[PDB]
Amino acid sequence: LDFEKPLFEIRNKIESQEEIDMLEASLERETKKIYTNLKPWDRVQIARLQERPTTLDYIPYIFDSFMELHGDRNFRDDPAMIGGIGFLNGRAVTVIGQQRGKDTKDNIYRNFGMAHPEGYRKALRLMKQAEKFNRPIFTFIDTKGAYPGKAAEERGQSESIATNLIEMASLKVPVIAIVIGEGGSGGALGIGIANKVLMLENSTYSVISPEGAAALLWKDSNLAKIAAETMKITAHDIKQLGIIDDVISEPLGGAHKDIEQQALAIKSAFVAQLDSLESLSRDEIANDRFEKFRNIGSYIE
Amino acid sequence: LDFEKPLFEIRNKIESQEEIDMLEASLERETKKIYTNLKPWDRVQIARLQERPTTLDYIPYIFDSFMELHGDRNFRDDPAMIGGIGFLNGRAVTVIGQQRGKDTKDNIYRNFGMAHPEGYRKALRLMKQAEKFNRPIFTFIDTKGAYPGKAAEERGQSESIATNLIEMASLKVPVIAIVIGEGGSGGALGIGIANKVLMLENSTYSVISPEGAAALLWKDSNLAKIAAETMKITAHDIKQLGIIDDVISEPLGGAHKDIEQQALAIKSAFVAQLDSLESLSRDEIANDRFEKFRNIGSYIE
Amino acid sequence: IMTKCPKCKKIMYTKELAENLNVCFNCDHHIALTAYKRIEAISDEGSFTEFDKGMTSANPLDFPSYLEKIEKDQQKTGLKEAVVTGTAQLDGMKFGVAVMDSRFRMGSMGSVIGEKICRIIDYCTENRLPFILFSASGGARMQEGIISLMQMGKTSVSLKRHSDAGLLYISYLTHPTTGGVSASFASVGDINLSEPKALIGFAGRRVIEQTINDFQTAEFLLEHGQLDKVVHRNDMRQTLSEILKIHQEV
Amino acid sequence: IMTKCPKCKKIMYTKELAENLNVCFNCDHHIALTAYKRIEAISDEGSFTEFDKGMTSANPLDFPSYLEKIEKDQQKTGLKEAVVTGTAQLDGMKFGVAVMDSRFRMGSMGSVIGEKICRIIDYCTENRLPFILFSASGGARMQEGIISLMQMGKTSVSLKRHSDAGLLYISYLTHPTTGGVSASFASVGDINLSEPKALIGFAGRRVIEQTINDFQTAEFLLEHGQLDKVVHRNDMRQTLSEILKIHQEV
Ligand SMILES: C/C=C/C=C/C(=O)N[C@@H](CC(=O)N[C@H](C(=O)[C@@H]1C(=O)NC(=O)[C@H]1C)C(C)C)c1ccccc1
Ligand SMILES: C/C=C/C=C/C(=O)N[C@@H](CC(=O)N[C@H](C(=O)[C@@H]1C(=O)NC(=O)[C@H]1C)C(C)C)c1ccccc1
Ligand SMILES: [Zn+2]
Numbered sequence A, B: 001l002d003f004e005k006p007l008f009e010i011r012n013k014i015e016s017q018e019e020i021d022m023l024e025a026s027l028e029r030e031t032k033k034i035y036t037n038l039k040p041w042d043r044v045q046i047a048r049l050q051e052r053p054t055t056l057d058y059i060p061y062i063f064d065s066f067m068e069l070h071g072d073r074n075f076r077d078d079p080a081m082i083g084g085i086g087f088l089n090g091r092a093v094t095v096i097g098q099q100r101g102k103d104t105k106d107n108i109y110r111n112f113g114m115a116h117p118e119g120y121r122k123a124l125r126l127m128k129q130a131e132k133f134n135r136p137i138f139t140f141i142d143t144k145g146a147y148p149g150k151a152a153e154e155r156g157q158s159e160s161i162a163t164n165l166i167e168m169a170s171l172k173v174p175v176i177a178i179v180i181g182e183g184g185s186g187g188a189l190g191i192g193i194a195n196k197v198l199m200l201e202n203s204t205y206s207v208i209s210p211e212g213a214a215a216l217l218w219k220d221s222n223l224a225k226i227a228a229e230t231m232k233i234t235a236h237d238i239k240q241l242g243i244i245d246d247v248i249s250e251p252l253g254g255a256h257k258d259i260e261q262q263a264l265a266i267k268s269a270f271v272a273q274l275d276s277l278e279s280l281s282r283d284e285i286a287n288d289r290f291e292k293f294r295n296i297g298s299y300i301e
Numbered sequence C, D: 001i002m003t004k005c006p007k008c009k010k011i012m013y014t015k016e017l018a019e020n021l022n023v024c025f026n027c028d029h030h031i032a033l034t035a036y037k038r039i040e041a042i043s044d045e046g047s048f049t050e051f052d053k054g055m056t057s058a059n060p061l062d063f064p065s066y067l068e069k070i071e072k073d074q075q076k077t078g079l080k081e082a083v084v085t086g087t088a089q090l091d092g093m094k095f096g097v098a099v100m101d102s103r104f105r106m107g108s109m110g111s112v113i114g115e116k117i118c119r120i121i122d123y124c125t126e127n128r129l130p131f132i133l134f135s136a137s138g139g140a141r142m143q144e145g146i147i148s149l150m151q152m153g154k155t156s157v158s159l160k161r162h163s164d165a166g167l168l169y170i171s172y173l174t175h176p177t178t179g180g181v182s183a184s185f186a187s188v189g190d191i192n193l194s195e196p197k198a199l200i201g202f203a204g205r206r207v208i209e210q211t212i213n214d215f216q217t218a219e220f221l222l223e224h225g226q227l228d229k230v231v232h233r234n235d236m237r238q239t240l241s242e243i244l245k246i247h248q249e250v
């Protein structure tokens, strides 16, 4: 990693009498100082780490007896978008999310967690089922945008996403969505129209990639660090704007360092947010979501 | 045509003094005697005539200002299944049907009125819209089954049809369906779950083609005439069983002889059946359809 | 006391084969499971009630040698018709069920099958019970012609009423599921399950060829979006158990 | 007083070109129609009311040179922002409308566009009026970042509430309709209409290339199921007129 260059130079000299003790103590504090005080672009590379925990990593630690359900009753089962039904402290729930892949070969299988339009329709189907049986819906956002190109658009990628947006808007069941990887604009919002939205402290949420922003606005792609800082894509940035409802703590170094530690934190959030929404009935919870997204944005009358 | 062999032999000799007057008078009565007393297999060839009036033939004479609407918001616009919105004596209505094609090149375009699964989804979309805006739904059945094969099944032909069946069942708007060509089993029932079902006197309705029945049950395909007679596929046969609600008269020789004459008859049926269903509200008309199909079939307790 | 595996041709002692739920030990091929077996394989001991145990077919279209063709299968099978229906329990949770049996007239759907499936669906609706259907069929029964077609409508109507009550319908497609059946209730489950190597399609080559002169497998259908799960029969009970528990009316 | 046709390069007298609704006489190419023109081209004379005539943008993310980039387009266009909204009538039938104008910041959707589209959608909902939107956009406005994204949600929410009241929303996609806009309200009309040769897609080649290192035409989208109708501008008025009449609350 880029910002681990100083940490690399410290432990390079220790692996060559009294220096060793002081350097190793010095490593302890500096490693903390760095990971405790993170710059926005440091957070973007942490979220892009191949080893960052995927949805299927988190589920077993959070939900009891999770059963994957496949397909869109239409065209295909999208590897990149998984879903199913399980339990959360006794109560049946539906779970949905983008699946990033763990190793190289597995990334190829999952199309890096970029959903085709069949993925969004599969997500929709499952949420309609949840609404039907009154199950809460948890979604996991982890995508660098929806799968682009002719083939994708040729099967209604625009429409797959837009339909989700309008159906999610009026879901008469609680929806809680959480960003664990990147939050690729519309691909992310396609399963992100939630009553409460949560983010991992080192995850991303944005209309475009900083590299995209750089090639369009800065007219030079090799300027993504600055674009990212300008774009305000960090968990904290988004929290200040009132777009998300909370930021979850992350283990030192990144969520990938300790999956179980991280997964327990997601459950405590899931549980606590879900308890907000118990007062709300089937009509009232739809209205709650309406009132969240209706009131986002700033203008001058 | 097969049963016009006697009529052919009569006018062969007239086109060669007192014979001519008597033969031409004799032609008059025999031509009537034949077309007024039709055998079931005579009716099957009449329905298979390339020139038999299609849906788009009938619409202009029945509905005012018909606008075709295209597509399934999914994959394609199926040439074989057309639909749109128009007027019927003042009232907005939705219209749907299979489109058979008029000439050879046009049959190729329309895939002979055999719908792909995108066709049934396009039909469904339009009826849901009708239900939403409280428009009555008229459907035109004219198909020798839904388009078969890998490609079709590979995109959910079974599911496209089954979904229509369950959605049509609970439509809170009146549905009136009519057979004008053949009624190819499931392809026909896929847009035929109606409050009232009507048939042209020389149209067909059946689980299989008589040629199909012959190759399976008689183990010899060249026996379709007998299969047809056994199968009871005529408009009258179906009327006796209580599966359809009325049979429309047809001009001498076939509906293709006079399209306007025939189209006016379809409107008077459409209008009269629709007037049955005025007493029924949005909940009650769904129940009416339930009670039609719930009570079809015979068994021994 | 011996049943031969059609796939790998190895001969087996039926007693143990039944205890393996008719799964071939050698090649893992899933042999057909008769209606009462299927029911036993998924229900708690002594919890099954059978609905309409003695409903026979009749002949509306006066189709030749139809009633006697029915006897041949009644006598050979022991069943009165090609669907067994009733209520049962699984790990304490009640549910209605309709298992189709493809030995009796290839499991084709006529008036009796429609009426029995409706009567159970309609029962479940009253008593708010999930409903589970095991399809095994070659399509519509051609001997009752148009009536067999209308069974697709008759069934769908009860099913949608059952769905509008917020009630779970699991569609369990067994080998083989085709024609009217796959184009009706078999395709429209809230959850659609099938079994390894089961053959699922719409129109057969003999019908499609005359009507207008391994892609049907369950694993293929799951790739192409139409199945929630391909369930090995070793996980059937557990799978169905959990599904009902998730859908348990709290 | 002259506008050149980009397709065939033939120079024309704007007066008559405007009377042909900016359709090229020679090659039939559909030139862009400004918001107030579009509105005039479809509404009864003197029936237009404009909602929120003076709502300006602000800068939440403090994006450099953003507010001045807005002035450049205000001064050049005459518009306060890239969407004009209000109510009008067509052959006696009232309707709310939102025309987007792609000269003002490529018609990108920021907070103002979301709020104005919601305010009209929400008005129509109260007064039970059909609503018609003309999309012309390059996607989300990147200068307001995540807020621009959330406009997709903000809009959808009002639209679905509007739909749940049984009210007609016609989506009229004009050249060009892309990105967030096509992935939001532009795709979800009860009826979706477009125009000959209009360019409709999702992600651009510049975005897709950096984000992960004629198929966009309207006629192509109609083949591939996503448009109810490709409407020549000579039939626009009549087409919209009939649609509203069919959806007239009797
Ligand atoms: C004795 C003759 C038995 C013929 C049974 C048969 O061929 N069924 C076919 C499936 C089939 O085409 N079923 C038909 C059927 O139900 C479909 C229906 O609902 N609408 C159709 O157009 C038929 C294809 C039956 C009416 C024949 C088949 C083929 C291969 C494997 C399994 C089933
Ligand atoms: C000054 C730079 C202007 C860049 C505008 C741009 O390239 N828009 C693209 C369309 C596009 O990719 N829009 C993006 C957009 O709205 C999409 C969105 O909602 N989610 C995405 O991931 C984006 C593709 C913008 C945020 C850039 C385009 C390409 C070709 C013709 C018309 C539009
Ligand atoms: Zn074997």
Ligand SMILES: [Zn+2]
Pocket: D005, D006, D007, D008, D009, D010, D024, D025, D026, D027, D028, D029
């Ligand atoms: Zn030109």
